């Protein structure tokens, strides 16, 4: 139940990715723009569905308290395998089952915290168990569970 100041800051940083204009609410339009920047192409009906599921009052947008309520509860879910696969799909935008340095760099630039190109190479190398220069799904699961 207990949330730390650091956990709240982490959830705030996740919220700020979707609130493109920084005005305090996530709109359906912003959600679509961010999803497409992460290589996905949701339908307008899917976008409206996602807003409605998080929007606790009726006003049609997501504010941070609504976002935090959903994320703090998700922190107590046990389906870790499904969440890690969703993260894998964010990186693996071409769906070939392997994350390249270029795919990692692309996600990095969209999500905020900057990594140098040397750090991108290092992150790939340290997860690349079999040494083909890319991160497959089973390597990614081990990376994300450490």
């Amino acid at each position: 139940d207990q949330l730390t100041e650091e956990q709240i800051a982490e959830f705030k940083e996740a919220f700020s990715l979707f609130d493109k204009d920084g005005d305090g609410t996530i709109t359906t339009k912003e959600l679509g723009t961010v999803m497409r920047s992460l290589g996905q192409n949701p339908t307008e009906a899917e976008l409206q569905d996602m807003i409605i599921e998080v929007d606790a009052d009726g006003n049609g947008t997501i504010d941070f308290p609504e976002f935090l309520t959903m994320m703090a509860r998700k922190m107590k879910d046990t389906d870790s395998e499904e969440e890690i696969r969703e993260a894998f799909r964010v990186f693996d935008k071409d769906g070939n089952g392997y994350i390249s340095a270029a795919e990692l760099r692309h996600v990095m630039t969209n999500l905020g915290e900057k990594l140098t190109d040397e750090e991108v190479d290092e992150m790939i190398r340290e997860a690349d168990i079999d040494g083909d220069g890319q991160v497959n799904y089973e390597e990614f699961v081990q990376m994300m569970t450490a």
Binding site: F11, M50, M70, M71, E113, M143, M144
Partner: peptide
């Protein structure tokens, strides 16, 4: 539910991975 919630939580998990990586690398 898990489909919608999962997209938002996935970006958190990725941001956390990057943040922990950078913090550990620069640990004094």
């Amino acid at each position: 539910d898990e489909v919608t919630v999962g997209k938002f939580y996935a970006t958190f998990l990725i941001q956390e991975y990057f943040r922990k990586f950078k913090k550990r690398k620069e640990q004094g």
